[PDB]
Design an enzyme around this catalytic site. Structure first.
Site, mmCIF file in Angstrom:
data_model
loop_
_atom_site.group_PDB
_atom_site.id
_atom_site.type_symbol
_atom_site.label_atom_id
_atom_site.label_comp_id
_atom_site.label_asym_id
_atom_site.label_seq_id
_atom_site.Cartn_x
_atom_site.Cartn_y
_atom_site.Cartn_z
ATOM 1 C CE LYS A 5 -2.468 -0.722 3.666
ATOM 2 N NZ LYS A 5 -1.743 -1.959 4.030
ATOM 3 C CD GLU A 31 1.987 7.308 6.860
ATOM 4 O OE1 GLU A 31 1.812 6.328 6.110
ATOM 5 O OE2 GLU A 31 2.572 8.348 6.496
ATOM 6 N NE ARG A 32 5.069 0.201 10.027
ATOM 7 C CZ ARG A 32 4.049 -0.117 9.241
ATOM 8 N NH1 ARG A 32 3.503 0.796 8.458
ATOM 9 N NH2 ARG A 32 3.578 -1.353 9.235
HETATM 10 N N1 LIG Z 1 6.957 -2.623 -5.769
HETATM 11 C C1 LIG Z 1 7.549 -3.457 -4.887
HETATM 12 N N2 LIG Z 1 8.569 -4.253 -5.255
HETATM 13 C C2 LIG Z 1 9.171 -5.093 -4.394
HETATM 14 N N3 LIG Z 1 8.813 -5.203 -3.107
HETATM 15 C C3 LIG Z 1 7.802 -4.464 -2.602
HETATM 16 C C4 LIG Z 1 7.102 -3.529 -3.485
HETATM 17 N N4 LIG Z 1 6.162 -2.930 -2.743
HETATM 18 C C5 LIG Z 1 6.247 -3.433 -1.490
HETATM 19 N N5 LIG Z 1 7.228 -4.343 -1.407
HETATM 20 C C6 LIG Z 1 7.585 -5.092 -0.183
HETATM 21 O O1 LIG Z 1 6.696 -4.704 0.860
HETATM 22 C C7 LIG Z 1 7.395 -4.061 1.919
HETATM 23 C C8 LIG Z 1 6.785 -2.694 2.159
HETATM 24 O O2 LIG Z 1 5.383 -2.836 2.289
HETATM 25 P P1 LIG Z 1 4.482 -1.543 2.539
HETATM 26 O O3 LIG Z 1 3.745 -1.248 1.269
HETATM 27 O O4 LIG Z 1 5.322 -0.481 3.186
HETATM 28 O O5 LIG Z 1 3.447 -2.115 3.624
HETATM 29 P P2 LIG Z 1 1.902 -1.702 3.659
HETATM 30 O O6 LIG Z 1 1.472 -1.837 2.226
HETATM 31 O O7 LIG Z 1 1.311 -2.736 4.571
HETATM 32 O O8 LIG Z 1 1.881 -0.300 4.202
HETATM 33 C C9 LIG Z 1 8.849 -3.941 1.526
HETATM 34 O O9 LIG Z 1 9.691 -4.472 2.546
HETATM 35 C C10 LIG Z 1 8.990 -4.738 0.254
HETATM 36 O O10 LIG Z 1 9.732 -5.936 0.491
HETATM 37 MG MG LIG Z 2 2.007 1.584 5.285
#
Ligand SMILES: Nc1ncnc2c1ncn2[C@@H]1O[C@H](COP(=O)(O)OP(=O)(O)O)[C@@H](O)[C@H]1O
Ligand SMILES: [Mg+2]
Lengths: 161, 156, 54, 120, 272, 47
Positions: A5, A31-32
């Protein structure tokens, strides 16, 4: 959690916001704080936030997850107010990114029991739908302006229901 | 104190006759365990805080006695009696440098002899059957067993 | 000829098995000596820790 | 960063084709995955210095352990650590101080692993 | 587990049961066709074997070259079809090598190759795959015999192991001997046959080899289809029992979840 | 309670991993074959 996300929303800010003439608003809701700082510095580096001139193209509002529920339940409205002003008075296109708009609901749920309301289906406030509607109904493209709203919505435990 | 001569192992494994690998592998393993043990033990025995300690005891005289006895008394050390295998080294010099070397070199000498003998021979378009009989004793037709012509077993 | 040459080459380095044995024996004696040192040290410190604990 | 990246890719590929147990390419892929898997095991209260971890993972990921059986990988790991911690303390100090596997460091690591593998 | 775990498991097992029912129906149709085509091939193959059992041929007891052929298919899910055949092949190969022979192996079907690729991995003269996709024909047996003869392993004795089809529910594993013309020429029972040099007899041996391989193919495919039908029926029955148990568990869990949520609401309401 | 398509791999039990591997091995094999053919075509089309 952990599906992309935040990465996807950052990617959208990278593409659409960078090459977008109008203004932009980012309301980080519950969020963080690490991510808030990372975004601040990435935007400073890209140039949408200019600390020297008055050429900044992004306004930020932060209500991160260290705040008590009252502040998380209202930072969305603060960002929404900034976006609404840019929509109406400036009479111009606006973007509005929110991350996540589930923390607004959750923060509303953390105080409902103390305000004397009986809970609803799953430990949620009885006013979940009304409280969410009275907010999501101001994020709209009226005939006076135009808000493109991107919202990240946490789905607790992957449960879409 | 410690300075151990280095080893090559792939080299080491080339020098074990099949009848002796069962002890070579065991020796390798025992070396491994002992080396791990030595690495485990520290470079030095840690020091002792005699001053503080004797300052934290009532019968300071008794701890002083233990300290002094410790200082005066030392520990023993083993010897090389279990290293009697010293002898074996000399024996090896006999096979490696005296016996095996010598007969090996003589066998070499003979193999050369034969090689240059076999390399210096007339073009076959000029040779004669006696010459084959002598260069190759395999082409001889034993009259002692086949006296009659052709001296071959015709079924051949 | 070449087989014999290779055998002779191996003769030169035949000694590594004895070399390994020597290293093993020496460092085993060293290990035992260090164990003795540390064992006396540990027993004496426990010995005196008795008195301080009392 | 250099080594764990390739290790991560190798385990990621291995985890896909793992539920079963033919061709040379996928058979070797499973072999490498299993070697790396038994490489990652560990004991209790015996954490490793980062350079030692790099040495072990480098040995495992550069096709060296693919010859060994997978039940003996722990024996290797342990003996290799004990050997390097004494004979080649200088190389580990180099890796720690410079904080990267330079070309000369890589060539050394290569020769140490090649020698040790046969000698074991 | 939780309600979602149970729901996902129940859905998966329901899909599995549907698939196994469909496969049982398909296998039953293919079985009916295979029996229909097996009757004439049964008479044909029995006729082709007629000679050897009528002129009793004893294999020579002084030869070391032996051939083992094991007929199976590529398809799995057929129960203990490939297992029985491979087990008997390794039994016979062990016996022959203990008697001091030089055994080879031909595997008609992948599963045979696989079962025997750990031990006997080097005795494979040649193996054939693509079996079982379509009903075997005389073309297949001709190709197998042709590649057996072309590959210059002149064998001195032979055996073929296939699952003779007894009944829709039962089958037996057989071992039909195969002879090389060296054994036919030097058999005194063969002294009665007239107009028989060692060339017509060679063509006859080649044809009889094709015939026996084809017979084994038809018997094996019939038995395999029967076994697949039975296996799919049993798997569907097991999936049905598991579905019943999981449905009971799901109902218990659903009621428990309703009660839990309701009690939470009641406690919150009464705790104001 | 019903069942839906693509549920065996949604549960992720043993059958899910078994199916995933049965797919991945086959398509790795076919990818290898296609890459060999692609190399052959590359070489044969240089001239
Ligand atoms: N486009 C991408 N390519 C590779 N890995 C990704 C990508 N998007 C997210 N990730 C993986 O997801 C993690 C980050 O997720 P994040 O989007 O910050 O969490 P959330 O969606 O729950 O807020 C990263 O550590 C990475 O490994
Ligand atoms: Mg997030």
């Amino acid at each position: 959690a952990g599906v992309g996300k935040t990465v996807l929303i950052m990617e959208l800010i990278n593409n659409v916001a960078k090459a977008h003439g109008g203004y932009s608003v980012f309301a980080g809701v519950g969020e963080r704080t690490r991510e808030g700082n990372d975004l601040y510095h990435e935007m400073i580096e890209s140039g949408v936030i200019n600390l020297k001139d008055a050429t900044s193209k992004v306004a930020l509002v932060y209500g991160q997850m260290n705040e008590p529920p009252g502040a998380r339940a209202r930072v969305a409205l603060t960002g929404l107010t900034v976006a609404e002003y840019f929509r109406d008075q400036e009479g111009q296109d606006v973007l509005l990114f929110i991350d996540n708009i589930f923390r607004f609901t959750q923060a509303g749920s953390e105080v409902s029991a103390l305000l004397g309301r009986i809970p609803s289906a799953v430990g949620y406030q009885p006013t979940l739908a009304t409280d969410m509607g009275t907010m999501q109904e101001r994020i709209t493209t009226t005939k006076k302006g135009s808000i493109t709203s991107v919202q990240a919505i946490y789905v607790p435990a992957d449960d879409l229901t | 104190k410690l300075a151990l001569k280095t080893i090559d192992w792939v080299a080491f494994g080339e020098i074990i006759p099949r009848n002796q690998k069962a002890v070579a592998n065991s020796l390798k393993s025992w070396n491994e365990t002992l080396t791990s043990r030595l690495a485990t033990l520290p470079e030095k025995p840690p020091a002792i805080d005699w001053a503080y300690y004797k300052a934290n005891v009532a019968k300071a005289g008794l701890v002083d006695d233990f300290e002094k006895k410790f200082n005066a008394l030392k520990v023993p050390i083993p010897e090389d009696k279990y290293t009697a295998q010293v002898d074996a080294e000399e024996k090896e010099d006999v096979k490696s440098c005296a016996e095996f070397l010598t007969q090996s070199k003589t066998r070499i000498q003979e193999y050369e002899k034969e090689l240059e003998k076999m390399r210096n021979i007339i073009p076959f378009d000029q040779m004669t059957i006696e010459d084959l009989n002598e260069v190759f004793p395999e082409t001889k037709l034993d009259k002692k067993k086949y006296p009659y012509w052709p001296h071959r077993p015709i079924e051949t | 000829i070449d087989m014999e040459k290779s055998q002779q080459a191996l003769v030169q380095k035949r000694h590594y098995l004895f070399d390994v044995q020597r290293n093993n024996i020496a460092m085993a004696l060293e290990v035992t000596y260090r164990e003795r040192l540390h064992r006396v040290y540990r027993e004496v410190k426990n010995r005196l820790d008795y008195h301080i604990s009392v | 960063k250099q080594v764990a990246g390739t290790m991560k890719l190798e385990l990621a590929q291995y985890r896909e084709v793992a539920a079963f147990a033919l061709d040379a390419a996928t058979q070797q892929l499973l072999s490498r995955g299993v070697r790396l898997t038994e490489l990652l095991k560990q004991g209790q209260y015996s954490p490793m210095a980062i350079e030692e971890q790099v040495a072990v993972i480098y040995a495992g990921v550069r096709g060296y352990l693919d010859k060994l059986e997978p039940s003996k990988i722990t024996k290797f790991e342990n003996a290799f650590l004990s050997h390097v911690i004494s004979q080649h303390q200088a190389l580990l100090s180099k890796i720690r101080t410079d904080g990267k596997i330079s070309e000369e460091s890589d060539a050394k690591l290569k020769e140490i692993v090649t020698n040790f593998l046969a000698g074991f | 587990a939780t309600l979602k775990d149970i729901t996902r498991r129940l859905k998966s097992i329901k899909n599995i049961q549907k698939i196994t029912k469909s496969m049982k129906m398909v296998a039953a149709a293919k079985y009916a066709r295979a029996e229909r085509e097996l009757k004439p091939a049964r008479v044909y193959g029995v006729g082709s074997l007629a000679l050897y059992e009528k002129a009793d041929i004893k294999t020579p007891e002084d030869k070391k070259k032996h051939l083992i052929i094991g007929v199976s298919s590529d398809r799995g899910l057929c129960g203990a079809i490939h297992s029985s055949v491979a087990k008997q092949m390794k039994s016979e190969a062990a016996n022959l090598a203990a008697a001091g022979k030089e055994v080879k192996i031909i595997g008609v079907g992948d599963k045979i190759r696989s079962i025997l690729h750990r031990t006997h991995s080097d005795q494979f003269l040649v193996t054939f795959k693509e079996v079982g996709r379509r009903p075997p024909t005389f073309g297949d047996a001709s190709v197998i015999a042709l590649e057996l003869l072309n590959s210059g392993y002149e064998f001195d004795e032979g055996s073929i192991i296939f699952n003779r089809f007894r009944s829709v529910i039962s089958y037996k594993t057989e071992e039909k001997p195969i002879f090389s013309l060296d054994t036919i020429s030097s058999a005194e029972s063969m002294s009665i046959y007239d107009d028989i040099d060692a060339d017509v007899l060679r063509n006859y041996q080649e044809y009889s080899l094709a015939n026996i391989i084809y017979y084994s193919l038809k018997e094996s495919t019939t038995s395999e289809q029967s076994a697949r039908m039975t296996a799919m029926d049993n798997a569907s029955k097991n999936a049905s029992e598991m579905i019943d148990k999981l449905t009971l568990t799901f109902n218990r869990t659903r009621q428990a979840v309703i009660t839990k949520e309701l009690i939470e609401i009641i406690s919150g309401a009464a705790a104001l | 309670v019903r069942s839906s398509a693509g549920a065996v791999r949604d549960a992720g039990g043993a059958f899910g991993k078994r199916e995933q591997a049965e797919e991945e091995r086959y398509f790795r094999a076919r990818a290898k074959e296609q890459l060999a053919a692609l190399k052959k075509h590359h070489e044969n089309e240089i001239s």
